[PDB]
Amino acid sequence: LQGKSVDLTDTRDYGSLTAAGLGQEWYGFGQTVFVRPMEQAWQQVLTPAAESLNARWRTAVVDGWNNAFSGRYPFKNVSSDASLPLLAKYLNTDTGRIARFL
Amino acid sequence: VVPGMFTRQAWEEAVLPSIDTVINEVSPEALRQRLTTRYFADFGNAWLNFLNSLHLRKAQTLSDVTEQLTLMADVRQSPLVALMNTLAVQGCTGQHGPLATTFGPVLALMDNQNNSADMLNLQTYLTRVTQVRLRLQQIAGSSDPQAMMQLLAQTVLQGKSVDLTDTRDYGSLTAAGLGQEWYGFGQTVFVRPMEQAWQQVLTPAAESLNARWRTAVVDGWNNAFSGRYPFKNVSSDASLPLLAKYLNTDTGRIARFLQNNLSGVLHREGSRWVPDTINTRGLTFNPAFLKAINTLSEIADVAFTTGNAGLHFELRPGTAAGVMQTTLITDNQKLIYVNQMPVWKRFTWPADTEAPGASLS
Amino acid sequence: QNNLSGVLHREGSRWVPDTINTRGLTFNPAFLKAINTLSEIADVAFTTGNAGLHFELRPGTAAGVMQTTLITDNQKLIYVNQMPVWKRFTWPADTEAPGASLSWVSTQAGTRQYADLPGSWGLIRLLEMARRKAAPGVASGWSLSWQAQDGRMLNYTLRTEAGEGPLVLLKLRNFVLPETVFELS
Amino acid sequence: VVPGMFTRQAWEEAVLPSIDTVINEVSPEALRQRLTTRYFADFGNAWLNFLNSLHLRKAQTLSDVTEQLTLMADVRQSPLVALMNTLAVQGCTGQHGPLATTFGPVLALMDNQNNSADMLNLQTYLTRVTQVRLRLQQIAGSSDPQAMMQLLAQTV
Amino acid sequence: LQGKSVDLTDTRDYGSLTAAGLGQEWYGFGQTVFVRPMEQAWQQVLTPAAESLNARWRTAVVDGWNNAFSGRYPFKNVSSDASLPLLAKYLNTDTGRIARFL
């Protein structure tokens, strides 16, 4: 999603290089055997990896946030206070532990 | 053993010349067409009773369960296809044939002319079991501290699974869809070699999870909360903040143990901890343990709702026969009734005080 | 982040073993207990990049004590049994004589001070000599109670803002860095 | 062990006369195809269950490992060029050959004719494994090898 | 010396792993066919280390010990005193100048 040369994005850019070179007459055959069975892995490699960004967010931000601000004002209406110099380590825009996770 | 007389080679000899001897002894040429069906009813029925009477060799201790899965699922020098080769050619006697309904699903496997059957066949299954052999070869490799054995089994636990919803269920997706008359064979041809494979890579995790269940939750619970109110009736007290750090609804040391070790087999849907019907092998939970944490996660949504120990109830006094004044003091919240108009008084427990307790006169 | 770049992750606040690339490479399980403790003190006391935290004390009452004086780092708390308030302390302040001292004026005798522990770690010496327990009445509280001489108690009520407050530096008591990262056997 | 009865000297000698003893004893010259390909399909299937059976000598402590990679990639004194030599002589029995679809791939490695010039070739593996070994002789002596061994194992 | 060894546990002991496993009637031959050429090799690279370690043992520990602690109580019985903090900086259990030399 950011770089190149994995190579699951390169073989698709090799497979299409043959199939577009055939004739525009074998379109539908070149698209069938040269780019489909590589692109079929990409739709297959996504939905497990989309799950792995859930278990690296409830163990990297949420389980640090809940570990320090569970049951403090102004999250929960109680007596105690959330801690301000620890709050600024989370919600910054440059070095906060949320904005340095994304 | 199947007694012969229902083969292909016993069909080429000594039957089709033989039944025409009795034809000269109803039109006589229409004797075969009744005799063949009452032969082909009992052709496969001696084969059905043989193959539904087979078992697989009992294997244990991780040595031979690889040795099974490399004898099985090997190319031609191997069983289970040589048995399926013998079953292959006998499903074409006669001339697709007259024995279609008895050898239907079993010869629906090997053909590769099943062009729309969801493809459900034998050949993928033996490579579907050769990789459960192969990842078990690495455990048969080093296994040096007895860890890296459960590191493959930790995937069967907490949801690192991306493959194992295919390797367990393919043995059942064929046989439980075979024909239900091949039941008893389909169990011991497909799911019984696979089940003997998982139950030696799974069961030394479930006996190693219980050592990681006590030494992080229970032996801090029983070490500190034993023999205290209200787990008993003694004067000694369970310290309510340490009760809050165990059973809290999202940060306690139980809910931060299930969501770090049983995140694959155990979900918090709503306010209960339900197991998962898929992705359990069988894994048999302790039925008290699904009842224990269903009770603890019910306390935490009413008494421990903020995250710390605290709640607010109201109280309205009631009367009786022969009482004048009834006083109730709890944690320096006073309630005094002398049979006047009843008003609710909002209470709080626990209260910030230097003398916590109750008294009733 | 220079030598264990593959096998150790900075997840959240703790360090975890990376599950990939851990074939036959085991950490000493005291070492992961060590630098998860040394990165849990780091998120309570040393948050801003230097030593500083803010804990709130509320004074308490005791049988037959007229005045308790707690002084830390030239910040007073003189309590002569009035309606108790919260005095938001800080530690370690950059004052001229950092220390910690506790003096109680009895009913019977005059002012006998309980302890006078100077230095920048005066206050941690004082909370070490307490008899502390968890506080149910206030969260997140800790009802300290130093026992003075003459059988008199001095009660206080520590409420901190995050984690454990300056009780968390009493994880450092008899703390030793492990000499071995990877275990070999 | 492969049971004998299959090698190149067993094909030219004493099965080609021996097929001629049973055919005189159905048209025979058509069974001479219907018997040899039944033999050749069992010729390969006894070789594949020999070569797939072989494992590797369990070595340890970094000198037995680096002495294997001398002995594995050393022309004129090694297996895997002396093995693939005698594997090449039995991929050409018969006459390209009749079993050239079964010994086809393994004979395609040791070719080095490589008209594509980017094959896999089993050379450019023995000069690939021996540039791993030359890394492990810079390490194991000369000098201070525990320092260098991390600096390899860190960048993997 | 100090555990930079990854190879030398093989080159010294292979000469002995054969000969002392030969037959014990070839003893006297197995010593001088295998371990005696190897022992003449190590004893000419090991001896000028052990004769050069002793120059790095005195010029970091002993000649700061005998230079400063000689003729003092309780290494003698004189009125002059060994300065107890400098005794602590030598023989300390994990930071002293001996345990940070070994």
UniProtKB/TrEMBL annotation, chain C:
Please indicate which part of the intact protein appears here, giving the first and last residue numbers and the full length.
Answer: 925 to 1109 of 1129
Which protein are we looking at? Type VI secretion protein VasK
Which residue ranges does the record assign to the Type VI secretion system IcmF C-terminal domain? Answer: 55-161
